Amino acid sequence: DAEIVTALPVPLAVAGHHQPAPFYLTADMFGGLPVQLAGGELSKLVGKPVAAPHVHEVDELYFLVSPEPGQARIEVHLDGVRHELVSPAVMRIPAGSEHCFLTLEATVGSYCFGILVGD
Amino acid sequence: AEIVTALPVPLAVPAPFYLTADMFGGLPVQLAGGELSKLVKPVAAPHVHEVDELYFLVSPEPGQARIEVHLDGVRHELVSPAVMRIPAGSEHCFLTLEATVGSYCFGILVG
Ligand SMILES: O=[P-]([O-])[O-]
Ligand SMILES: [Fe+3]
Ligand SMILES: [Fe+3]
């Protein structure tokens, strides 16, 4: 009686996002989780932002990872200031901060995961 | 801006951690894992945690990674994308059967 979820990702609407965002952990899974986790592989997102600037009422972490360090790079807009992240990197977006990201560079297997931290 | 780049953090469980409980003033999860293409290795050690752990299996394209999760004497074969809950106190481990470059299994300890 292991609990396994394979109906994934779960498309959920997120503010400012052009398309539904793909979630792999949602707050209601397994009786309730303190985080939600969405994101995906970046190799076909170079130059194409997934969202307009937006704000959450919870903290969000960007987790940028790739098989080899340096293989992925995103630009995070944080209240009108641009920050370049190079894999591997984790960036905290405080609740209420206006933000979005643009993929600068990405190999196959590069991911950006957004982790909403439930307070 | 709060950016952490000294990653992964090797911690004995050493596992490569990308989120640790003390980051950013305290986090409700920890996240460890790594790329699976170099783990496809003959053996894996059963172990237990005092918190729940979620396995998160992903690959660039669905179905490109496959693991065996051993959970309290039961074998489970999972295909990406998959999420599996390992309850605290359960003896468990996983073995990578198949993985393209850029496949990950992340272990997420839920506080
Ligand atoms: O859609 P975002 O939470 O990665
Ligand atoms: Fe966001
Ligand atoms: Fe474990």
UniProtKB/TrEMBL annotation, chain B:
What is a single molecular function from GO for this protein?
A: metal ion binding
UniProt key word Metal-binding: yes
Q: Which UniProt keywords apply?
A: Metal-binding
Annotated Fe(3+) binding lies at 47, 49, 53, 92
User: Source organism's superkingdom?
Assistant: Bacteria
What is the protein name given in its UniProt record? Cupin domain-containing protein
Q: Which organism is it from?
A: Streptomyces albus
